[PDB]
C-alpha cells in the first residue's frame, strides 16, 4: 500500500469505477455517489444522495488502508447480495432449511 | 430444526434454481440430490464455475450453514460487480490516485 502508477490510474478507475462514480468537485451523482473528498468527509455522507441502510452498520471513515479492504469486496456491503443466490441471514432459517434438505436430498 | 419451515424456505428461496429429487434436472444450479457427504462441484451432468476448485468442501451441516449465510460471495464476478479488485498491487495502485482526485 504505497504509491502506484498514474497513467494506469486513469485507466483502472475508468475501467472499474467511471460507470458508477464521478469525482471532480461538485461532480454529478450516478448509481453511486460522487467521491469528491471521500477522506475527511465521513463515510456515507454525500449530500444530494442518501445511501442504503448498510452505511448504518459499518461506518468509520476511509483512509489509505482500511478502504483498500472495501475494494476487495464492496458488494459484501450492498444489501440483498446475501439473499441473491439463496443467502439466509437467520441461523434458525439455515437450521430449518438444512433440516429439510438433509432428508429431501438423501 | 423445523423441516416443515425448511420445506417452505426451500420452495421460495432455492427451488427457482435447484431441484432435489433423485434424477431431478439441473437448472441454473445443479440438482442437489445426495449433496450431503459428497464434495462440492461433483453433481453429474453439471459443469460448475471454478469457485469450488480452490474452495472445495465435503458438505456437512456446519459448512452448509456457513455457505448458505452467503453463497453469492463464491459466484465469480460478484466481487468485481461493485468495484472489487483482486490483486493487492491494483488497489494500492488506484487508491493513491483516489487521494489525488479528491483534492
Ligand atoms: C456500480 C456497480 C459501482 C461500481 C462499478 C463501483 N461502485 Fe462504489 N458504490 C456504488 C454504490 C451504489 C455505492 C453506494 C452504496 C450504498 O450503501 O448506498 C457505492 C459506494 C462507494 C463508496 C462509499 C462512499 C461513501 O459516501 O462512503 C466508495 C468509496 C466507493 N463506492 C468507491 C468505489 C471505487 C473506488 C470503485 C472502483 C474500484 C467503485 N466504487 C466501483 C456503486 C459502484
Ligand atoms: C439461482 C439464483 C440460485 C438460487 C436461488 C440458489 N442457488 Fe444454490 N447454486 C446456484 C449455482 C449457479 C450454483 C453453482 C455455483 C458454482 O460455483 O458453479 C449453486 C450451488 C449450490 C450448492 C453447491 C452444489 C454442489 O456443490 O454440488 C448448494 C449446496 C446450493 N447451491 C444450495 C442452495 C440452497 C440450499 C439454496 C436456497 C437457500 C440455493 N442454493 C439457492 C444457484 C442458486
Ligand atoms: C456505502 C457503504 C459503505 C460501507 C462501509 C464498509 C467499510 C468496511 C471496510 C473494511 C473496514 O473494516 C475493518 O475490516 C473488517 C470488515 O468488517 C473488520 O473485521 C473483519 O475481519 C474478518 C476478515 O478477516 C471478517 O471475516 C469479519 O467479518 C470482520 O469482523 C474489521 O473489524 C474492520 O476494522
Ligand atoms: C459448488 C459451488 C460452491 C463452491 C464454494 C464452496 C464454499 C463453501 C465454504 C463455506 C465455509 O465453511 C467452512 O468449511 C470448512 C471446511 O469444510 C469447515 O471446517 C471445519 O469442518 C471440517 C471438517 O473436516 C474440518 O476442517 C474442521 O471441522 C473445521 O475446519 C468450517 O468450520 C466451515 O465454516
Distances in whole angstroms, Cα of residue B24 to Cα of each of B17, B43, B68: 12, 11, 21
Nearest of B103, B101, B102, B79 to residue A70 by alpha carbon: B79
Dist CA A79 CA A40 (whole Å): 25
C-alpha cell at position A57: 452498520
A29 is in an annotated binding site: no
C-alpha cell at position B90: 491494483
Contacts of B11 (CB under 8 A, 6+ apart): none
Q: What residue ranges do the domains of chain A occupy?
A: 1-106
Nearest of A101, A49, A48, A82 to residue B19 by alpha carbon: A101
Dist CA A99 CA B2 (whole Å): 7
3-state class (DSSP) for residue A35: coil
What are the CB-based long-range contacts (under 8 Å, 24+) for B12-18?
Answer: B13/A83, B13/A86, B13/A88, B13/A97, B14/A86, B14/A97, B17/A85, B17/A86
Contact list, B1 vs chain A (CB under 8 Å): 95-96, 98-100
Cβ of A22 closer than 6 Å to ligand 1, yes or no, is no
A83 is in an annotated binding site: yes
* CA–CA min distance B41, chain A (Å): 16
The CA B67 to ligand 1 mean position distance, Å, reads 25
The residue whose CA is least distant from atom 18 of ligand 2 is: B48
Nearest of A16, A5, A25, A7 to residue A72 by alpha carbon: A16
Cβ of B15 closer than 6 Å to ligand 2, yes or no, is no
Residue A38: closest C-alpha in chain B: B102
B14 is in an annotated binding site: yes
Amino acid at each position: 500500500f504505497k504509491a502506484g502508477s498514474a497513467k494506469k490510474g486513469a485507466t483502472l478507475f475508468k475501467t472499474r469505477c467511471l460507470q458508477c462514480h464521478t469525482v471532480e468537485k461538485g461532480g454529478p451523482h450516478k448509481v453511486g455517489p460522487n467521491l469528491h473528498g471521500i477522506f475527511g468527509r465521513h463515510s456515507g455522507q454525500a449530500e444530494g444522495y442518501s445511501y442504503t441502510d448498510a452505511n448504518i452498520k459499518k461506518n468509520v471513515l476511509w483512509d489509505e488502508n482500511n478502504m483498500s479492504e472495501y475494494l476487495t469486496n464492496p458488494a459484501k456491503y450492498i444489501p440483498g447480495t446475501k439473499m441473491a443466490f439463496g443467502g439466509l441471514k437467520k441461523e434458525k432459517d439455515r437450521n430449518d432449511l438444512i433440516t429439510y434438505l438433509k432428508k429431501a436430498s438423501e
